[PDB]
Amino acid sequence: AALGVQSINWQTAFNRQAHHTDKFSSQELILRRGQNFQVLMIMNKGLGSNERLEFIVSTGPYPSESAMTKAVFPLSNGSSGGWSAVLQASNGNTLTISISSPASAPIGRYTMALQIFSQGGISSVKLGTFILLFNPWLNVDSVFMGNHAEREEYVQEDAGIIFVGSTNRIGMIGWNFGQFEEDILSICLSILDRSLNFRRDAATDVASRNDPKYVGRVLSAMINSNDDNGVLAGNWSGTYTGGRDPRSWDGSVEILKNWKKSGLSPVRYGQCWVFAGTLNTALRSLGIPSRVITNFNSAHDTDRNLSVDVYYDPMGNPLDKGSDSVWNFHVWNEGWFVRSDLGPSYGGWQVLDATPQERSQGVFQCGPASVIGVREGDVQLNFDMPFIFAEVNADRITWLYDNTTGKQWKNSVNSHTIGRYISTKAVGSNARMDVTDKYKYPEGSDQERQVFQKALGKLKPEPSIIGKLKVAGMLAVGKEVNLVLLLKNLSRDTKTVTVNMTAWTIIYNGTLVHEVWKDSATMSLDPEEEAEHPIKISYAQYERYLKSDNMIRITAVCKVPDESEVVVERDIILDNPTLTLEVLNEARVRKPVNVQMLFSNPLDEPVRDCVLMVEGSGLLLGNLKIDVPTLGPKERSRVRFDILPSRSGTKQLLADFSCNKFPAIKAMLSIDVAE
Amino acid sequence: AALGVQSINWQTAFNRQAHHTDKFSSQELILRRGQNFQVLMIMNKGLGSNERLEFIVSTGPYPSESAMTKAVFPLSNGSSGGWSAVLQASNGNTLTISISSPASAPIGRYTMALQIFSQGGISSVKLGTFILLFNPWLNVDSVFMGNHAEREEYVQEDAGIIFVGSTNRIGMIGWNFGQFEEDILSICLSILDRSLNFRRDAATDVASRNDPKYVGRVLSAMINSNDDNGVLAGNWSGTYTGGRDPRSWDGSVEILKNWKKSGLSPVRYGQCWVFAGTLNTALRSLGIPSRVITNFNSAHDTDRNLSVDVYYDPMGNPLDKGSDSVWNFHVWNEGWFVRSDLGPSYGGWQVLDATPQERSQGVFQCGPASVIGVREGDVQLNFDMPFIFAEVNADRITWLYDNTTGKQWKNSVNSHTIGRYISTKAVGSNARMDVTDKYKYPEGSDQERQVFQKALGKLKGLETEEQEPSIIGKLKVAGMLAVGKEVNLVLLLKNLSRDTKTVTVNMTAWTIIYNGTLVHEVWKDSATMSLDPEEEAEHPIKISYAQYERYLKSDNMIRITAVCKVPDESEVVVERDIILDNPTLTLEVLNEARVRKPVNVQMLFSNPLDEPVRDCVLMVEGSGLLLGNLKIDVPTLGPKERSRVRFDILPSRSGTKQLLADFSCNKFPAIKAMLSIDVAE
Ligand SMILES: [Br-]
Ligand SMILES: [Br-]
Ligand SMILES: [Ca+2]
Ligand SMILES: [Ca+2]
Ligand SMILES: [Cl-]
Ligand SMILES: [Cl-]
């Protein structure tokens, strides 16, 4: 009989453990490039002296050796270079074989076949399939990350923390990346088979999958549904009918599965952190060390002049014209890999932004931009350096505009309000790690200014009255809003100040929703005198136009005769009533544990359409949706439910409580699961 | 000023599209007979009431009205008989004219002139030339084929499939008809001006070009180079020095172009499917619906009253006499047209065979033969019915002949081993369509027996039938058969009597050519077994690569024979022709296929031998994918080694296209590869 294969033992557990791919729920053989994996192949006879076995691996719809998307290699006693198979031992008809792949191999799904030369003939049989991913553990892989703890956080951690809020108060929300949850890896890999690039030229696209710079850019385009091809639909209108309020999501898992389940139609709706969390899931799952970055006072310079304008009218009203030019915060991602296209000094973290803001080469894609390059103002380098540089360095120009007279006039310029407290979750804890100093030099330093001049050069070759808005007491949805406008006359003359104030509910990016309060006043201030004007906005006044952001834009345009106006600005955040989660016993793998959701209605009216949503990788499979009955005024809602720990370690339970009067109330709970 | 033509607008694109001749690469005006075409003729002035225009068309060297090779017709307001010109509109000095031709007009190249009668004088000017072809779309045309699907296949399709192999395994080879490729129509038209018929009497030959029976028959004569006039030179010797191995060709395109290019000397070399593929190109190009037929176990000799003899000696050797009388398969063609010379019931498919076999009317030409007429045994009708009927109905008589004693004796008769699985490519797909029931009635039916007697009766002492052979034999193949691997067979013997008999077995193995041409003995042996009543036994036959490789030809065929004998009883002959597969050869397109966009293709091959493979040449072609034939030299390929060849193709026509490749090297001549490709706009 001719030489043939009887069975193949992929020793999946062993290899996946060695390749650090064992956390994936899948049962498939998952591997990382440039690393050896061992298989046992039982033949029907002994390897003849004149017989030969040649392995064949291929990926994509047009496997080609010249494109590195196909490889043919013989069984040897020594390792070649890229792909190779070494016979380490023979026991009976069983051949212990160690297969190797090149550190530069394209990632994705592969098929392995075996060609057998025996008895003057040739036979071919398919051995099976496997998944190949980037290898942050391999020193020669472009995504190499040498530090153990860092790699665990940027690749293996499926529980995250995203910072939000504003410069006045940095808050945070938990996010379930869940890259290891069932079918998530699969879906993320399929994204590459659905890109505009793939449709344009499948052969070249798959061959380019050996480049994290390429895979990263494609993902930044595919995470949004713009260009009629992607996952998430952006919506910053404050009205989310026909979809889900962006702030209600707790992770990337539901978004990706819903995307697949709906035949790849847009998932409604998401905002920047939602795009970032989902992008982070794709990057980590594929093997690209990545993390979520939040930039506060993030600007959108549309005409590449490193400057943005914000307008107000004399009545103190913010104008749509630029109300969203400087977001309270904006979230994006950073990917870790070298930049062979830029040089040895631009490796490391690379900015990737999936939020559809600026079109790049005609498509809503953004990055990879070297963070180090951004810090030095080398904006001619790929990709999208000008836009990203502006997000953290732009100047903010305040304008006054009177539509009635058609006149417009410069009020002031601030070169440092934009690009503050750039944050990311610390390695191994929920602490806030500030990485502002990574994106730019200290405000005031020469470098800061030298860099700015540098970048700009490449793109385009006294008030007597001081004001400040202060928050009085606690701000929470249901309670009245109390503020104070503090004014002081610094001149030696008595001044008469005319004050025009407004309050508008907004979306975090600055989208103006509706006026909820306005007032004016005239105060006479003596030299050096300080006066306060109280600002009170009741719940009845703002509740009707307040959105899930729980934000209000307070503005005070003050003016003294013969002097330029003085604009006082302040975006405030009202806290949602508290929502709490509590485990009612010790947590242990595969053992049910009861949990408790606590919530008290602070309103004088009942709260209806109450829905509780809970999830957490390693604690629960998927999303748990619980309908909660109408809760009367001052009443408490006690909800109980069980979770079933499946993986030991420090886990994260997340919940969303949405009702007619309170959309997207969030709750987070850290749980240590024991073996 | 006298009336005169300033210019003429043939509206070539418009007319060719309407006439279904737009696929031809040519720029010329190509039209079909019996169908109107419109022209715009700009005169120097308005057409006067007392002026007149006479159109004049002519074809051939001796155009005459009486011969229909010349026609003179006036510009009128109503259409008429054969040729006619109708003035549809007059704008300024431009005349919109609709010219019509008769459905019985001779095909070929025409010249059109204009005679103008003006101011008491007569002027004449040549307008131009055009090509007239048969019109399968016209109901009154003898080649009319009403069904859309069939017509597209039998006329418009330039990619084909020809079935080959044997009754034990029907294989298939792709063929590039390429009737639309550059110069092909011109060359096929030129054949008519080169026939023995044309040289004899050009006047009559040309006038006969209005008849598909005539054109078809002439083509059957000119596709072969016999009679010192024609295209392909046959060669079934297994040695093709000075020419090309018949199995290496992939189409009719290189063949016809080589013919023209060589000054019309013989193209070496071809075998039946090559003649058929080439004849198919000519037929489709000229407008005659046609297809390729393959008859397995085809009677090539049988010139002795519907019967062929095959001889063997007692040692089990096949004898040269009759070894090639019954080809494993023979390929020919069928043309679609009415038979006004035979009657209304004989129209349809007509057998046409360009393979030089039997001389007819002093020339190597064959057909047309009504397929319906063959089925009915009406072998008195033209043309060559006796022979074609025999190819599919002949009896096969096996003989034993001992040279030493000069004695020969009938072994057995098989009235149904010949004429099997007659096949042709299905309409629209590569599927195999069996048409055996179209050539003859089922075996066992009284119909086929009646027809046989009938046919036999129109053509032109005791063999006591013994008792059951007692010994039954059959040869079976063990494992796959491939060039490079050893051949393994098993002779199964069974004693059906009940007295325990002793059997002497003499076996041999001869490499052959598909037609039966014996090449060389590569194995022989003998055995004497004793079988008890009802007992079965099996003798193993093994032939190593080393033993046959030296004498195996591109056919990769071997004739296995076993002469078995029991005392006091006629011998039992067991025969089996086998086929060894070539190593795999595969083609891979490395991207989507789109019109006018280059795409890379990959040639994949692995040498299964323990020795190198040299003089490797890759030949690729496919109408609508490449212009002509791409020849690629491939470096010496080592043992168990793989070849990595890439090359680009450039789709030029959307639709399902067929890429063909031939890979020949010193150890493996003519390995074939086929790949269907969908080209989008
Ligand atoms: Br605040
Ligand atoms: Br066979
Ligand atoms: Ca998109
Ligand atoms: Ca001839
Ligand atoms: Cl998966
Ligand atoms: Cl031509």
Swiss-Prot record, chain A:
Sites where the protein binds Ca(2+) 2: D301, D303, N305, S307, D324
Residue(s) carrying N-acetylalanine: A1
Places the protein is found: Cytoplasm
Binding site for Ca(2+) 3: N393, S415, E443, E448
Major subcellular location class: cytoplasm
Cofactor note: Binds 3 Ca(2+) cations per subunit. Binds 1 Ca(2+) as a zymogen, and binds 2 more Ca(2+) cations, or other divalent metal cations, after proteolytic processing.
GO biological process, one term: keratinocyte differentiation
Record's comment on post-translational modification: Activated by proteolytic processing. In vitro activation is commonly achieved by cleavage with dispase, a neutral bacterial protease. Physiological activation may be catalyzed by CTSL and, to a lesser extent, by CTSS, but not by CTSB, CTSD nor CTSV.
Recorded superkingdom: Eukaryota
Family to which the UniProt record says this protein belongs: Belongs to the transglutaminase superfamily. Transglutaminase family.
Disorder noted: Uncombable hair syndrome 2: A form of uncombable hair syndrome, a condition characterized by scalp hair that is impossible to comb due to the haphazard arrangement of the hair bundles. A characteristic morphologic feature is a triangular to reniform to heart shape on cross-sections, and a groove, canal or flattening along the entire length of the hair. Most individuals are affected early in childhood and the hair takes on a spun-glass appearance with the hair becoming dry, curly, glossy, lighter in color, and progressively uncombable.
Function in brief: Catalyzes the calcium-dependent formation of isopeptide cross-links between glutamine and lysine residues in various proteins, as well as the conjugation of polyamines to proteins. Involved in the formation of the cornified envelope (CE), a specialized component consisting of covalent cross-links of proteins beneath the plasma membrane of terminally differentiated keratinocytes. Catalyzes small proline-rich proteins (SPRR1 and SPRR2) and LOR cross-linking to form small interchain oligomers, which are further cross-linked by TGM1 onto the growing CE scaffold.
Protein name: Protein-glutamine gamma-glutamyltransferase E
Species lineage: Eukaryota, Metazoa, Chordata, Craniata, Vertebrata
Gene (name only): TGM3
